[PDB]
């Protein structure tokens, strides 16, 4: 079990850890989150009571250091920071926990939800997508743009997702124009799986990471990536049987975790009707299909 202390809570903010969240009042004595399961990635995130725009947060893993949170009044926002003095860190942790000013990561033990959403997410893959290699954590917000958006402006602040484009030379073998554009198996298996991602698990991890960036920050480009990685699989006639069956579980839990009121900007009508009813893989997302129809029948 790990901890992420906070120096202080100067401003009213809604704080999130993973899929949990708390209201913290201006200069309430709040000092951090305890009982955080070691073993997966986590994300802590923020929405100020004054500016319901820009949700922002940090992705991290306690196994890579000791991280804490401090407000920066010059920049007006909470900043993740690493403490390198190990002794100094366990010291502030124990004092605050004794003073009990910390909330506990509230994990019901039946709930595999977080593990189901982060199963394939790795910090190391993450820090390639959010390049800032002087920190062991990764910052994301609502407004950051992807590299594919930039092409169609500031690159330090870019989400370097893997670029998928169905009408590109990459995706279309000359002479197999019709074949490849109706049946993307080429693109998926050789170009993307074997070629760029190397294995199905990196792929799923990026897809899973893109979903969460969309859910927590409303990052519109993260939404686009997630939908395209889904479309690539569903629009392929030849997919490993292990990947179909895992994708059904991945999507199921994503759809299950989504706030009910945000279905309109976060789900792309066309991709989903294609995946579930038009594509090669209609028959292969029994779990994802059943949950979509009983929760969001309107979108379909």
């Amino acid at each position: 079990m790990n901890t992420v202390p906070f120096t202080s809570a100067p401003i009213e903010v809604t704080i999130g850890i993973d899929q949990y969240s708390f209201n913290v009042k201006e200069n309430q004595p709040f000092h951090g989150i305890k009982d955080i399961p070691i073993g997966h990635v986590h994300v802590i995130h923020f929405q100020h009571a004054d500016n319901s725009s820009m949700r922002y947060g940090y992705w991290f893993d306690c196994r890579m250091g000791n991280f804490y949170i401090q407000y920066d009044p010059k920049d007006g926002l909470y900043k993740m920071m690493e403490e390198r003095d190990g002794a100094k860190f366990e010291n502030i942790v124990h004092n605050f926990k004794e003073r009990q000013m910390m909330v506990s990561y509230p994990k019901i033990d039946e709930d595999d939800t977080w593990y189901n959403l982060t199963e394939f997410v790795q910090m190391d893959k993450i820090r390639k997508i959010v390049r800032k290699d002087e920190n062991q954590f990764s910052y994301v917000d609502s407004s950051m743009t992807t590299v594919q958006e930039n092409e169609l402006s500031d690159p330090a602040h870019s989400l370097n997702y893997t670029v998928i484009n169905f009408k590109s030379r990459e995706a279309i073998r000359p002479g197999h124009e019709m074949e490849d554009f109706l049946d993307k198996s080429y693109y998926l298996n050789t170009v993307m799986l074997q070629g760029i991602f190397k294995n199905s698990s990196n792929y799923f991890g990026e897809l899973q990471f893109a979903f969460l960036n969309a859910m927590f920050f409303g990052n519109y480009g993260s939404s686009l990536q997630w939908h395209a990685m889904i479309e690539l699989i569903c629009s392929s006639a030849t997919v490993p049987k292990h990947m179909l069956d895992k994708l059904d579980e991945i999507l199921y839990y994503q759809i299950k975790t989504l706030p009910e009121q945000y279905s309109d900007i976060l789900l792309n009508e066309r991709v989903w009707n294609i995946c579930l009813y038009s594509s090669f893989q209609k028959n292969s997302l029994h779990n994802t299909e059943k949950i979509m129809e009983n929760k969001y029948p309107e979108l379909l």
């Binding site: 279309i172 124009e177 019709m178 554009f181």
Partner: protein, 237 residues
Amino acid sequence: GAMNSSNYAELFNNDIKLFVDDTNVYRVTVHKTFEGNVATKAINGCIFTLNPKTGHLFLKIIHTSVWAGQKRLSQLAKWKTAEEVSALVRSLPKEEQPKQIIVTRKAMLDPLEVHMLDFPNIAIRPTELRLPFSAAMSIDKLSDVVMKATEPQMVLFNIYDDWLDRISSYTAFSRLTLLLRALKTNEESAKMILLSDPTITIKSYHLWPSFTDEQWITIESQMRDLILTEYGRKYNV
């Protein structure tokens, strides 16, 4: 973006552009078989590729052999059309390659776009106009050459005969669509109107008759009147 009545005169500036009409690429007949089930027979088709400014027509003939042993033919037709327009662009010298291609039917967008990936600076565009290029096989010499072909074959025409010697592209293109519009709506009449007077002949290198200026007025008046007459009959007006 899409081409409509606002951006209509763009067709006639000096930017090379082509229309691609694919309505006559895959042409069948429908007949009953001996057991009474329904079957199709394919006949020769044509891709209809036109430079509205100069009148240059690139009539790619689609031989029924192209279809042999193939499924989802109406789908394949779109992709075969985009294949051949591509080969045509590749076959032309750079300075002649179009800057835009306008597809008469939106379902051609994705096939062409895909087949033209090697030409990213060639904009593929749809249109909202209702062009009448399916009536192209109402032009006796276009249909004859299509019907008579024994292999894939390309045939060059100028669909304006020699009209540009005396009228502008804009006007030329308006005559064309008027004539095809009329031929689409009532072929028998349209053709009656064009050929009634046996003393006005079609030059062997031409498609339409050699009307004088005055006669083209009478003809255009008569095609207008035809198209009006047929609309009343269509909707009871």
